[PDB]
């Protein structure tokens with residue numbers, strides 16, 4: 109088995125590094141003063157970048173691969189998407205869900221993703237998708253640590269037996285309690301639904317991840333209740349507010365007041381660039397707002413924010429290959445995080461910040477941690493992002509679980525020339 | 532030499548097709564009723580998509596690869612970009628320009644791009660970059676047909692000897708007359724500069740491509756003068772309005788009135804998604820406008836619109852590998868052209884529509900045309916876009932000028948499995 113990763117570059121560090129492995133864990137990390145020779149049991153990073161695994165903090169594996177079934181989301185809105193999904197949800201079968209979830213999970217393994225948080229719609233008395241996903245979680249465990257969010261897609265108080273079904277999902281083993289306050293019939297139901305969500309999370313000792321204010325409504329401020337309840341309960345690390353796209357439309361004075369609470373609360377934020385740019389701004393004519401939450405300001409304020417893919421060929425998103433560098437690319441452009449350092453540091457949005465969002469306890473290139481790491485054939489985050497590089501090797505427990513032999517491009521000029529798009 | 536392209540899918544057509552080649556041209560195109568066997572002199576498209584070459588209708592090869600030299604565009608605005616470029620322009624040398632232009636051109640050849648329109652800043656008494664680019668045009672001719680736009684970056688009337696230098700550039704051989712009305716000191720200089728641009732285009736029988744209303748100013752309406760002058764002169768096919776980002780901010784009533792003229796005029800439009808999403812909206816706080824011109828409405832109205840990359844690692848854009856499918860991906864998201872058919876038809880925005888913008892006379896998979904075509908390892912435009920596929924083969928004059936052996940990804944589950952991200 110592998111004993112060392114050599115010739116590795118690490119974000120924020122100068123030079124090359126060697127990562128020693130023992131019993132499936134990282135035993136030590138030592139700097140190199142030059143290039144080390146390869147040998148059996150040594151995986152050569154070849155002066156590429158070594159980082160802990162990519163993370164998918166927000167995806168819907170129960171809906172993945174169902175776009176157009178039985179109908180397409182014509183308007184490209186969150187609301188029609190939920191209606192189209194309702195039609196598909198009525199046709200779910202156990203094997204259907206497992207097969208589609210596994211198809212996307214394999215793309216994720218290929219893309220160096222070893223941690224995934226999937227929401228699963230539990231506004232369904234049969235809990236068909238949840239039962240299937242709980243089996244998938246066990247089956248995929250050797251390659252991906254899958255967290256399941258009990259997501260009451262049609263509301264907690266606004267759907268028949270919504271609260272009972274949400275609790276049933278937790279009793280069956282869901283890892284995270286979800287909610288969707290802006291979809292509840294009234295603002296009061298929205299606020300009350302959050303009190304119920306927090307009570308369930310404390311009763312069962314589970315994490316929280318709310319689909320929060322995913323709407324271009326400047327009056328949708330459920331995020332302040334999520335943050336205040338987390339602060340009151342002293343549980344910010346365990347709480348996440350997904351989307352918060354309404355924040356894109358808030359006035360600046362309220363946002364400034366709010367940011368103090370967001371920081372004090374310690375809660376996490378997920379932005380979903382590919383889906384947000386598509387679903388938000390649909391009620392504007394021109395000009396049209398971008399609709400992504402205030403990622404740049406969160407980073408400047410030290411508030412933990414990260415990026416998810418959200419949908420992969422489903423009612424809310426017709427594209428995708430479950431590639432986090434592609435998600436990152438979209439987010440950096442739409443959020444205008446286009447300075448060299450902002451782009452280079454972008455990898456944090458799909459690695460460390462996402463691990464914090466998932467409350468991971470064994471993550472990072474550090475002595476004592478499990479030997480879970482990936483190798484990118486690039487010099488730094490900027491280079492990896494610019495060239496949209498594949499994952500050369502994905503290592504888990506000290507063993508290679510995925511590898512990509514890069515494409516080879518040649519142009520035939522006066523003489524053949526290899527093109528790698530580098531400078 | 533190659534005699535046939537077999538097993539080809541064609542956009543908008545059912546089944547498979549065979550493209551017969553003779554003397555560097557396409558002699559005939561015949562439908563197949565099944566898969567044809569390979570043989571020597573036959574290039575097998577392997578049921579992939581065959582299309583005429585990708586086109587780059589708007590790039591700046593004189594500024595490519597200079598981002599951060601001598602300083603970075605900190606604000607990420609058009610205006611600071613021009614100031615940073617001015618600093619770099621003072622340091623230009625003949626060989627400097629040729630080397631950087633050739634580096635990006637090689638990436639373009641690798642990416643199946645056989646037609647490129649580069650703007651070159653002629654607000655420079657020495658015309659250093661233009662002289663270098665005229666040599667590059669001749670040198671790259673076997674692989675790319677390069678058009679050069681004499682672009683008066685600092686204005687025609689607002690820069691010393693601007694008009695004389697613009698005309699000098701045409702006398703030296705520039706193919707297209709440029710302008711930048713919104714950067715002129717006054718609205719009157721802007722309008723007058725367009726009369727001068729059209730007079731020069733008619734005097735020298737050249738095309739026109741104006742950097743038009745690239746500003747989030749609802750009062751920047753130079754596009755109506757570009758279209759009206761083209762209509763008056765009966766030369767719409769030879770005229771292009773690049774950017775028109777101000778159109779994103781116009782009221783709908785004026786836009787409706789304007790669209791009648793745009794259609795009647797027959798002029799072309801270029802949108803530059805990667806750069807527009809980055810440079811536009813920089814003066815907004817929140818919400819923030821997207822800033823791309825009205826691409827969706829132009830398509831619905833039958834107005835020719837297409838996409839350019841604009842910058843590749845320069846003062847206005849820190850990223851890029853000169854990849855048109857990546858440009859297309861950004862445009863489809865920001866413009867909300869996310870319906871299945873809209874995405875599938877997206878290839879037109881980087882092939883046929885761009886060829887029309889460049890007034891190309893030998894373009895398309897048709898009998899009698901030069902055998903210039905590329906093969907994408909994908910089933911249709913949607914698939915090519917979703918998976919961001921490379922160009923498997925680029926053929927020019929019936930000869931292969933570029934090829935890419937695709938990457939090979941494997942996941943090691945209970946058994947090794949190849950992953951191609953297809954369904």
Ligand SMILES: O=C1NC=C(F)[C@H](O)N1
Nearest residue numbers: 168186319322418419424
């Ligand atoms: O409520 C939602 N359901 C599914 C989505 F993809 C979107 O994140 N929002």
Ligand SMILES: O=C1NC=C(F)[C@H](O)N1
Nearest residue numbers: 591609742745841842847
């Ligand atoms: O005026 C401009 N110069 C260069 C650019 F990249 C931008 O297209 N606009």
Ligand SMILES: [Fe+3]
Nearest residue numbers: 168227319418
């Ligand atoms: Fe979601």
Ligand SMILES: [Fe+3]
Nearest residue numbers: 591650742841
């Ligand atoms: Fe330009």
